[PDB]
């Protein structure tokens, strides 16, 4: 069986995230992002207090996660690779090549797992982020402004 | 420990641990320590208006 490799970008879910590399990520303590939003204002008369335009300043912070995958090597594979007990005959060269084929076929899937699992993490975080529709829709509708 | 060229050389190489009442933060590493070799830094990821 030839497994098919999946690249995260080709997936339609990639449209929901802005990916970017950052080699020195393990040294980040509290990544901080900033917002500054102003709101409009209308003027009225009569027994209404005259209002002033407002500004808002919002600050969010980064949340850190991780991904891990495993990769196994049997003892005989190490023995064949280290050449510690080699006899220099054509019989063991085939065994060594079998071990290396196993290692490479294994490593390909191990590397593919990160690509395949970034989508999993994005689904997980989006689920943990989304409030239910049945609440969000009326809330965003039946209150004009708030307070 | 931040690898800056020192501003001034210190004279009078005398025991410092005895007079540790002065100063506001005192640390003495025996020979070396992995707390020196830390580089945790804080990052700002751009702002939006």
């Amino acid at each position: 069986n030839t497994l098919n490799f999946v690249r995260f970008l080709e997936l339609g879910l990639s449209v929901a995230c802005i990916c970017t590399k950052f080699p020195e990520l393990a040294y980040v303590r509290d990544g901080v992002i900033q917002f500054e939003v102003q709101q409009p204002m209308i003027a009225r008369d009569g027994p209404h207090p005259v209002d002033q335009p407002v500004h808002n300043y919002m600050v969010k912070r980064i949340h850190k996660r991780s991904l891990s995958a495993a990769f196994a090597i049997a003892s005989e594979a190490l023995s064949l690779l280290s050449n510690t007990y080699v006899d220099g005959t054509e019989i063991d060269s085939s065994l060594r090549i079998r071990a290396i084929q196993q290692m490479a076929r294994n490593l390909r899937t191990v590397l593919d797992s990160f690509e395949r699992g970034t989508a999993d993490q994005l689904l997980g975080v989006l689920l943990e982020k989304a409030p239910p529709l049945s609440l969000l829709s009326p809330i965003n509708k039946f209150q004009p402004e708030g307070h | 420990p931040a690898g800056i060229i020192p501003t001034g050389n210190v004279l009078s190489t005398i025991e410092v641990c005895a007079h540790r009442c002065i100063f506001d933060f005192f640390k003495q590493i025996r020979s070396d320590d992995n707390s020196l070799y830390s580089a945790q830094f804080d990052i700002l990821l751009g702002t939006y208006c």
Partner: peptide
């Protein structure tokens, strides 16, 4: 994106950095 130059020296000596 990576940190270098003035950003690097700031992150090393002061402990903060900005894009």
């Amino acid at each position: 994106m990576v940190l270098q130059g003035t950003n690097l020296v700031t992150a090393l000596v002061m402990g903060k950095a900005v894009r």
